[PDB]
Design a protein around this ligand. Structure first.
Ligand SMILES: [Cl-]
Ligand SMILES: [N+]
Lengths: 144, 144
């Protein structure tokens, strides 16, 4: 085998956002921010917020996230690039990716490409925070 | 000449790790994992992680790897056996080996023996992924 979750750099996600799709295959993507208590202060524009603490405790919440991702994929070309992140993408981001992975059948996983955003929202804001076109709800004072 | 870079079987590397030195000349060795995005899910214990993408982009990072390898070679007996690998060892592992090779001057090269791990971490995982004594951070869910 090879692996079914990989890292994605903020610079790549940013390019995809600028271009409207992944660059090479022109595939759709969807950011999933899994922060709970530290979500405030900014998030990536157009991402979905499903706190990992709830996804892990609430099976219907995980089902909803999976449904929503599969539905979006059915509407687009190729595989849907799902990008999980939390604050650092060290614990919650990767755990949430694996929680979704475990819930995907073979047919469903082949419809997706699963990513963790390297560095989390912390790294994202450091270069992209101020740009309201890619970052929603940025509170620069929260980062002093 | 004969060649400066060759493939090494993962069975041989595992033996070197158990015994603590190479088989014929009892030389030291150092694993260099050059995966970037697909590093997630496990790696060889005690290896160093220098993504090929960064090694190519940032001469200072390449200079760091070289300086670190040469300082370790100074700390041991005989040539240091440097084992590069990536996921499949078809492209990045060999290109990384060649980047280092090109940076090494005459005497530096004499102090090293360069290897690429046949089959990459993909092959390693299939046989040793479960063995926590030789594999660190393994995430079986990623290899389904
Ligand atoms: Cl939402
Ligand atoms: N080379």
């Amino acid at each position: 085998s090879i692996t079914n979750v990989k890292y994605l750099d903020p610079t790549e996600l940013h390019r995809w956002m600028q271009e409207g799709h992944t660059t090479t295959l022109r595939e759709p993507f969807q950011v999933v921010d899994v922060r709970g208590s530290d979500y405030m202060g900014g998030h990536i524009k157009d991402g979905w917020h499903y706190a990992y603490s709830r996804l892990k405790q609430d099976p219907e919440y995980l089902r909803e996230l999976k449904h929503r991702l599969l539905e979006k994929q059915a509407d687009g070309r190729g595989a849907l690039n799902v990008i999980f992140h939390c604050m650092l993408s060290q614990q919650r981001g990767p755990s949430a990716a694996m929680l979704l992975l475990r819930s995907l059948d073979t047919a469903e996983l082949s419809r997706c490409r699963l990513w963790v955003l390297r560095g989390g929202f912390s790294r994202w804001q450091s270069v992209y925070g101020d740009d309201e076109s890619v970052t929603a709800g940025y509170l620069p004072d929260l980062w002093r």
